[PDB]
A and B are shown apart, each in its own frame.
Chain A
Amino acid sequence: AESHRLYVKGKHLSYQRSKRVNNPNVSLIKIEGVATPQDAQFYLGKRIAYVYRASKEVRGSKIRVMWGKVTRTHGNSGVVRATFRNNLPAKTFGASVRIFLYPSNI
């Protein structure tokens, strides 16, 4: 009906980091409804897309995308580690991400 979601709601939390050094090449991602590492294993390897808008239409779109994958889990609380084709800009900490259901195993 009015709902058309096929991906899972996710938050870009931060780069992988120590206390004072961060690694932009890896992003920490929250998955909605995942609070334990065991539930995060389902999403390992799944495609992720940060979807954003730009004022300049580039190739017939004003919506631009950066793609990535969930590479592994992070911590004890369901956060996952993610790498993107281009690293996320870091102004998107707390921004929304889309975790898709492909590549699928169920």
Chain B
Amino acid sequence: FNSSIGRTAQGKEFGVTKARWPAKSVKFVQGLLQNAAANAEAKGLDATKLYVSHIQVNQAPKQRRRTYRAHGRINKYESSPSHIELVVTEKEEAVAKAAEKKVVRLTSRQRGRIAAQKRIAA
């Protein structure tokens, strides 16, 4: 959602030219981040390995106003509220190992070859 917004050097660190400072969005996310950190503290989590593992903003129902246009016309003047949710988890180690055993199917000629290679080799 960056069409025809301004450019800045503070987007260089992200490899963009277009960036902004959404104060109201940042404050709301800060209040949610604080709620999540408080939720983790009451959950006994480490609270120094916590990272934003899930975060998502979708549209809450529109708050509807109206705006007056030329020649006695009315248009919508709508808010686009947000549902925000996020999940903070602490970073862990490798999840698992031991990939597939992959039960092998060889033909008769394949078995004879490796048996011949095995005796040829040492």
Contacts and interface: CB of A to CB of B under 8 A. Distances in A.
Contacts of A59: 105-107, 110
For this complex, into which size category does the number of interface residues on chain B fall?
A: under 10
Contacts, number: 9
B107 to A, nearest CB: 7
A59 B110 CA distance: 9
A89 interface: no
Interface in A52-102: 59-61
Contacts of B42: none
9 contacts: A59-B105, A59-B106, A59-B107, A59-B110, A60-B104, A60-B105, A60-B106, A60-B110, A61-B110
Given A59-B110, A60-B106, 7 more contacts: A59-B105, A59-B106, A59-B107, A60-B104, A60-B105, A60-B110, A61-B110
Q: Which 9 A-B pairs have the closest CB atoms?
A: A60-B106, A60-B110, A59-B105, A60-B104, A59-B106, A59-B107, A60-B105, A59-B110, A61-B110
